[PDB]
């Protein structure tokens, strides 16, 4: 621990096993403060748009979230080709998530 030691390493490889391919991907993120730390309520009238089909009510939050729900987040084009070219099917098994080297500025 401490300021001068890193809390994780970069690891964005792919390993092809017998019947298992393990994808790892590391990215650098930036997180701003959202809403000035507030929990504003939002509507279609909040943004002014008027149509009953488009009408909504909800809440804006000061939090962000992580989305990696796309295949290109985990497969290179070459890995995708290696998968689709000789495989009749695939499915996810287990997920690991890490968050390291945080710096507040």
């Amino acid at each position: 621990d401490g300021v001068g030691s890193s809390s994780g390493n970069w690891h964005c490889d792919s390993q092809w096993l017998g019947d298992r391919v393990i994808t790892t991907s590391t990215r650098t993120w930036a997180l701003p403060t959202y809403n000035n730390h507030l929990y504003k309520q939002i509507s279609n009238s909040t943004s002014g748009g008027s149509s009953n089909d488009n009408a909504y009510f909800g809440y804006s939050t000061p939090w962000g979230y992580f989305d990696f729900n796309r295949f290109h987040c985990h497969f290179s084009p070459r890995d995708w080709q290696r998968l689709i070219n000789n495989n009749w099917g695939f499915r996810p098994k287990r997920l690991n998530f890490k968050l390291f080297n945080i710096q507040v500025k």
Partner: protein, 105 residues
Amino acid sequence: SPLMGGFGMKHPPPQILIKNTPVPADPPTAFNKDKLNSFITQYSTGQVSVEIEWELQKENSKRWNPEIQYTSNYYKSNNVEFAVNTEGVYSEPRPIGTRYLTRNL
């Protein structure tokens, strides 16, 4: 390495030589020292099986790009490539080589 391509070996797979055993037609009743050129006409038939085990070198590229692959085409045609036609004669469409994947030098 053979100039026409393939694996050059000091001791390749041995030749298998096969012959119908000659069956003389019928000798004359009095003895003759000549070498009996009259024979019964015959041929043989059978089944032959060849089993080869091949060692493979699995492609292990870190290339992001999708690679060139040998493929058949999805365009309507009179016959299917590498099949038989209405006559029943099997034909091969083009000469397929083995160099489709890539490596760094």
